[PDB]
């Protein structure tokens, strides 16, 4: 209902919104970003580096290196999906997909490029002792440590780091990414933008696949997005996030046709004191638990 209407209004999206009367306060924001939990890409051609746009710039440095100049390679010879330099055997996939009939399909490495995704001569061009296959294999952390050089690469990898990742490689195919991981790579894309304070983010269960300790950092990021004027909306069951929220809107007592109506709105404490809300019925003791944990720490 909300996202589709806001989208058809703000970005002229064509998705038919759910049945509703009207939506007001539309003048209070310019753009609505729904950071989906759907995958990044549907082919191994897509990866964090591609989705973020890092891989675009990362070809520019290879195209500008000494050997490439004398070899005339440009930002296409090092291109993943371009015949110029990619492994003609795997057609730039790097991994051949085998056909498993009743079992799920399996990805077996290309026996010609050994998974390097480029031909022999393309990876002869070096950048600080490492080639494009090698840098595509690097970890995001190791990548930003490697690209402290270029600020434009750096400020993009930093987003992937702040997000919660930074343990995953630049060239890890999108088809092998967890739903939460994907959602988080998108969160990386929207992370660093000049916020005018008039944009609304929508995240569907960004907790999925995260430890509580990771929930901490992620909440730091999101609350930083809120700090800069923007609005962050989140569909969650995880109480460690719900308690952190400044405003919560609890839906339908029970599910099915027994529901689809507001149980309670307001601050976490205002909803915690609502007996008819299961959410607050499970939130109230968590509010009182950690509140005592802090006073125990503060007194010592």
């Amino acid at each position: 209902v909300l996202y589709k209407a806001l989208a058809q209004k703000l970005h002229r999206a064509k998705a038919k919104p759910g049945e509703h009367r009207d939506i007001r306060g539309l003048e209070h924001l310019d753009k609505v970003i729904d950071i989906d939990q759907s995958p990044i890409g549907r082919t191994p051609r897509s990866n964090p580096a591609t989705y973020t746009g890092v891989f675009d710039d990362i070809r520019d440095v290879f195209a500008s290196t000494n050997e490439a100049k004398v070899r005339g390679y440009k930002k296409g010879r090092f291109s993943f999906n371009v015949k110029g330099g990619r492994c003609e055997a795997c057609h730039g996939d790097g991994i051949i997909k085998i056909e498993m009939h009743f079992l799920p399909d399996v990805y077996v490495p290309c026996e010609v490029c050994h998974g390097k995704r480029y031909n022999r001569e393309t990876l002869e061009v070096t950048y600080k002792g490492k080639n494009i296959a090698e840098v595509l294999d690097m970890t995001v952390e190791d990548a930003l440590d490697f690209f402290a050089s270029i600020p434009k690469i750096k400020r993009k990898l930093e987003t992937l780091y702040d997000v919660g990742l930074g343990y995953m490689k630049l060239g890890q195919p999108a088809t092998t990414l967890s739903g939460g991981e994907a959602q988080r790579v998108k969160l990386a894309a929207e992370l660093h933008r000049r916020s005018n304070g008039r944009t609304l983010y929508i995240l569907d269960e960004p907790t999925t696949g995260l430890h509580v300790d990771d929930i901490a950092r992620l909440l730091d990021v999101l609350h930083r997005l809120v700090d800069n004027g923007d609005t962050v909306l989140v569909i969650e069951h995880n109480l460690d996030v719900i308690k952190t929220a400044d405003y919560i809107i609890d839906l339908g007592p029970e599910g099915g046709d027994r529901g689809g109506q507001i149980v309670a709105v307001g601050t976490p404490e205002e909803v915690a004191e609502v007996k008819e809300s299961h959410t607050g019925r499970y939130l109230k003791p968590i509010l009182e638990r950690d509140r005592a944990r802090m006073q125990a720490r503060y007194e010592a």
Partner: protein, 595 residues
């Protein structure tokens, strides 16, 4: 045997031209450092100087003070010397913005604006022609004093090819890259090489359509030809060929290795200083950018905005007087300064505007302090740079007259046209007076130029003139450069009978159809009512046989005195000449242009 100038002109020197030519040539040959041609408007200044240069045979730089005047001089000299290298050296400054910062709105104006291909090409054509042949004239804007990389580096780095030399293909293709060429087989443009196995085509930074073609038969170059790009039409058949760097800021590898370290040191120092005085933001900015540039330099021996490191790259002391285009010329080169009374002060101001712009950048951490050493020359360094010099003006400034052994006069025009007569009239009832005179001009199929001191008076006068029934256009103090030509041309066609503006010294206002020029507020304070400005303005009516000047004033200032007296003298001498030759003055006709 030298390649010498061959002046091609349908006419011969006439008037007091031969005497002036003889004087300036004799001066350049005797060894005078400073000379001054006081030439009235209407006489062949460009042609006279062309005669001088043609007679002396020296590499010459001629400086103008804007894109338009430059371009005109280029065209003229290219007509006068078609068999010789007539070169065009401007830069960014012609119509582009430089790197700057505004501490108020917090906006860093990048140097971004892509190096316009034509202009860059012309720059390289110029600098390369300077080393290749002797018969080279280079007209230039003031930009000829800007920061430019060393001549010796630009020289020694050249790939000097000869037929059948002991060279390898890949070696060459690496050397082209060291010098800042790019391979672009898929789009062959200027400053690009293209490999096709054993066919190597190189597009010199100096050329238009003429590209070089080198090949191999083993580890030895066979044939080297001049091919017409994207055609293959063989034009040349050279045995020796030298390919000069595509940038004027390229550097040796060792000198680069050292310079980088020096830059690291200066960066560390300025960083320590910034963080010491609490300017941490600036330190962050500076560190990011400087580190980026440093890595690009460690990688491929260059980056964008490499100019800002020139000094360090030259391994020269901090505060060093930069090398410029002047150094690229031989020792015994010759300088011509057109419209000196404005070009010389403009040259003088170039240092202060640049230093201010760069200092703000250093303050807020956009640059290292060494970026201040990549700058235009100060006037003194320019003075020291001079071998010989000839200033050209109708109204020579203080400096020119001061440093020159008097002046060489050229006052007689080839058509016998005289400097106009001058009427000075009271201010009371000036509008109606000028209106009547204008009506008389209109009856005689003639045009009028009117200059007022202030914009408000200009608009008020335009209104006052439209109501009288007079065809008048207003040349706004800042109107589109292409509309200028339109309105002026339309004045020539007679769509307008009068033209009102504040500054009449801006070019394009030499109109044979103009027989009257009115100068209101002739006695008032301002740059445009000065002696020289007044004479220059008076020179606008000298293009017509019935040319007349009306100054509207209540008093007679010193400037008005000097201007009137000078015009009187010139006019008397010109009528003496015409009497002595049996010449009747008549208006020079000129065809009118279009698109």
């Amino acid at each position: 045997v030298e390649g010498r100038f061959q002046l091609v002109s349908p006419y011969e020197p006439q008037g007091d031209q031969p005497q002036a030519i003889a004087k300036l040539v004799d001066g350049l040959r005797l060894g005078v450092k400073h000379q001054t041609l006081l030439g009235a408007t209407g006489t062949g200044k460009t042609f006279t100087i062309s005669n001088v240069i043609a007679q002396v045979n020296k590499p010459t730089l001629v400086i103008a003070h804007n894109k338009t005047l430059a371009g005109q001089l280029h065209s003229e000299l290219k007509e006068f010397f078609p068999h010789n290298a007539v070169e065009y050296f401007v830069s960014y400054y012609d119509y582009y913005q430089p790197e700057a910062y505004v501490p108020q709105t917090d906006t860093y104006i990048e140097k971004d604006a892509k190096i316009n291909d034509e202009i860059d090409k012309l720059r390289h054509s110029a600098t390369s022609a300077l080393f290749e042949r002797r018969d080279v004239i280079i007209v230039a804007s003031v930009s000829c004093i800007y920061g430019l990389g060393s001549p010796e580096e630009y020289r020694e780095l050249v790939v000097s090819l000869r037929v059948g030399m002991e060279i390898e293909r890949n070696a060459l293709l690496r050397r082209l890259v060291d010098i800042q060429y790019d391979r672009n087989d898929i789009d062959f443009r200027r400053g690009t090489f293209r490999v096709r196995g054993d066919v190597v085509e190189i597009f010199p930074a100096s050329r238009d359509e003429h590209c070089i073609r080198v090949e191999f038969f083993g580890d030895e170059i066979e044939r080297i030809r001049e091919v017409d790009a994207l055609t293959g039409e063989v034009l040349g058949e050279r045995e020796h060929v030298a390919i000069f760097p595509a940038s004027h800021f390229v550097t040796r590898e060792e000198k680069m290795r050292l310079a980088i370290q020096n830059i690291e040191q200066e960066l560390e120092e300025r960083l320590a200083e910034l963080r010491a005085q609490g300017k941490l933001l600036e330190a962050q900015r500076l560190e990011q950018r400087t580190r980026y540039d440093l890595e690009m330099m460690r990688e491929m021996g260059f980056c964008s905005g490499i100019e800002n490191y020139s000094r360090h790259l030259a391994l020269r002391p901090p505060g060093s007087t930069p090398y410029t285009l002047l150094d690229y010329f031989p020792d015994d080169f010759l300088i011509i300064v057109d419209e000196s009374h404005v070009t010389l002060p403009q040259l003088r101001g170039m240092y202060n505007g640049d230093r201010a712009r760069k200092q703000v950048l250093v303050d807020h951490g956009f640059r290292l302090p060494s970026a201040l050493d990549n700058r235009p020359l100060t006037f003194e360094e320019f003075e020291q740079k001079i071998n010989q010099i000839i200033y050209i003006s109708a109204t020579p400034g203080p400096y020119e007259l001061e440093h020159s052994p008097g002046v060489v006069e050229q006052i007689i025009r080839p058509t016998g046209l005289l400097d106009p007569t001058i009427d000075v009239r009271p201010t009371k009832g000036q509008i109606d007076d000028l209106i009547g005179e204008i009506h008389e001009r209109v009856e005689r199929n003639e045009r009028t130029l009117v200059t007022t001191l202030t914009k408000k008076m200009a608009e008020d006068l335009t209104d006052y003139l439209k109501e009288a029934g007079i065809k008048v256009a207003y040349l706004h103090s800042e109107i589109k450069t292409l509309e200028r030509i339109e309105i002026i041309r339309d004045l020539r066609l007679g769509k307008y009978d009068v033209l009102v503006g504040i500054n009449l010294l801006r070019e394009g206002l030499d109109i044979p159809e103009v027989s009257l020029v009115a100068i209101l507020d002739a006695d008032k304070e301002g740059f445009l009512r000065s002696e020289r400005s007044l004479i220059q303005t008076i020179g606008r009516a000298a293009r017509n046989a019935n040319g007349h000047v009306i100054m509207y004033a209540d008093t007679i200032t010193k400037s008005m005195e000097i201007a009137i007296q000078e015009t009187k003298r010139r006019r008397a001498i010109q009528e003496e000449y015409n009497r002595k030759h049996g010449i009747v003055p008549r208006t020079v006709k000129k065809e009118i242009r279009d698109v």
